[PDB]
């Protein structure tokens, strides 16, 4: 089942679950430079692609 895996399958599934999805975040500190959640959510997708 691992040998069956291919780069197109990888990009397909990773696009299926990672791309343009809403992240859940847990940050135990110190924290302040950690981006506000909109910066992260907008960090989840490129404008070039």
């Amino acid at each position: 089942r691992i040998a069956e895996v291919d780069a197109s399958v990888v990009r397909e599934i990773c696009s299926k679950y990672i791309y343009d999805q809403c992240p859940a975040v847990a940050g135990y500190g110190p924290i302040e430079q950690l981006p506000d959640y909109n910066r992260i959510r907008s960090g989840m997708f490129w404008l070039r692609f």
Binding site: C22, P23, E32, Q33, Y37, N38, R41
Partner: protein
């Protein structure tokens, strides 16, 4: 200098926040929105309005008095007789 990595110290103040897509852009607008704006107006109202009301009385008077100052031309000829 005053970048986010180095500002005020603060200690265990936990906070919570939903994703924008997980929630409506117009939560409970009528039940809470409008009355809030109304409370705000009721707070600002007496502080703000009366001076403006005072201004209006002066504005009305000035024009009206000027009307007496000029349009009452007949009062002067009437004084002539």
């Amino acid at each position: 200098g005053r970048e986010f990595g180095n500002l005020t110290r603060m200690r265990h103040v936990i906070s919570y926040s939903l994703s924008p897509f997980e929630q409506r852009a117009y939560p409970h607008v009528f039940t809470k929105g409008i009355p809030n704006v109304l409370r705000r107006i009721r707070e600002s109202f007496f502080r703000v309005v009366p001076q403006f009301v005072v201004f209006y009385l002066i504005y009305t008077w000035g024009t009206e008095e000027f009307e007496r100052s000029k349009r009452k031309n007949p009062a002067a000829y009437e004084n002539d007789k």
